[model samples]
Target: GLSAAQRQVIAATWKDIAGADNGAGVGKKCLIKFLSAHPQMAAVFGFSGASDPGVAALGAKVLAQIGVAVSHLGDEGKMVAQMKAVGVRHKGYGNKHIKAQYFEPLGASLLSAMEHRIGGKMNAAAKDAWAAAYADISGALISGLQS
Candidate 1:
């Protein structure tokens, strides 16, 4: 588990990256807010409501898997191996269905928040940037899993 200070670093970094633009920042903020407010969504993986519980739980799990791969073998081919493992896990959890119900709404909410924050100055580029930031954070976990 990330220490309180570590979690603070993660949260701050997320905000700084996500808040770079109007739309994307809003989107990223929305996700951060959603995850913070609804502990249950994050708790699906047994994370507790302390700090950014959802992201923390997800990050920790991914890192643990990566640690295992790195321990047994090495970093040489871990990325592909871990990516496959993540894909399989998502498939097992019906990620397609879950995404349909969750991802779109989450995006919309983030966009809305961005609109509110920027007084409608959020553009497509901003939205894309926000999404990219999100992917980057998520990819960190993926990379960790592979490590």
Candidate 2:
């Protein structure tokens, strides 16, 4: 669980990052970058590459997942359970299985996207808060994935 201060930083920063668009742009951008950096990951999702037409929609969905997690920051227990459930769903995608290692890379890409989106406003505190949040999130998801 995150401390009160960390929660505050995450919640405050996320509100703007998610915005009215629900982070569609940021999500898509992050996915493109992530897929480019780790092309093999695209195969896990049946994507050919970052430029695949489906990437945009999937990216938006991915970010929305994060938004959902952010919304539950007030209750880490519930958030973990929910993420675990999501992980279970990701365990198999039409024969491709998701590995635990993939989660952290995605988290890192999401962080990079968020940092880029926030640009000048991003600070060390905000970065640390988000990093911690994703660490906890991915850990819970891996727990679920293993189960």
Candidate 3:
């Protein structure tokens, strides 16, 4: 469960960042950063053909959907239905080394991207909130990878 203070940090900071010019690009930026660090991830996203434009387009959709899901974190019961649907559609049956682990790097890169956008405002406390929220969101969804 997310704390009240963490919720405020997420909603406020996320809104400010996503509302800015070219804010939508954050997902692609974070995606690129993560892929660069873990190129193996590209294999999982078989549709991604090693191109910025291609990956960036998919990355935007990915970012937007996760943003929508995470917004409902305060109500995990509601969030679970939607999040599980995504996980099911993503993982298929029996897992077999699906994308569950990739969520870790993706969240890390996203945190870094937001920190860049937020400048010094993303303090230690804010980063902790972001990290915790990322884990909770992914934790809820990743379980579905097990079929």
Candidate 4:
């Protein structure tokens, strides 16, 4: 239930906010807030409780890797490889469900953080750049979800 335009917005906002000091931590905190506000989202992610800081830490790390892979490879194949790596870790936890739970919310969180941190300072072009960055990272997560 997502529109391409919305995806673009999310991606843009996410890129703007992703790699600064505490960006990941900010995203993780936002995710917890969002999940608490929208519990159904948690079910999609396969979590039975409110977001856990530990899980968020793991999720943030995965997101960072996705960001790097997408930035460098600029290809779905490489993104898929990154996703597989995350899946391997999930498999270790006996739950290959992390992708579904974490990806979109993480994207949303990053975007929100961007907006919050940068306020209205970034121009439209800057926002677009941020969206592209977010898309790269989010796209990688989507690839992982397919696995």
lDDT of 2 by residue, 1-147 (tens): 899999999898988788788899888998899989998878788888899978899889878988899899999889999999987887676336777778778887898888888885569889888989989988988898889
Assess every candidate by TM-score.
0.33, 0.93, 0.84, 0.55
Question: Best-fitting candidate, measured by lDDT?
Answer: 2
Question: What residue pairs clash in candidate 3, if any at all?
Answer: none
Off by over 4 Å in 1: 1-28, 36-39, 53-99, 122-147
**lDDT scores for all predictions?**
0.44, 0.86, 0.73, 0.56
Cα lDDT of model 3 by residue, 1-147, tens digit: 688988888777777667554356777778787778877777766535345576787767766776786678678687777766777776653223675666787898888888877888799888998898788777767866555
* Ranking of candidates on lDDT, top first: 2, 3, 4, 1
**TM-score of candidate 2 to 2 decimals:** 0.93
Report the candidate with higher lDDT, 3 versus 4: 3
Steric collisions counted per model: 1, 0, 0, 4
Top-TM-score candidate index: 2
lDDT of 4 at 47: 68
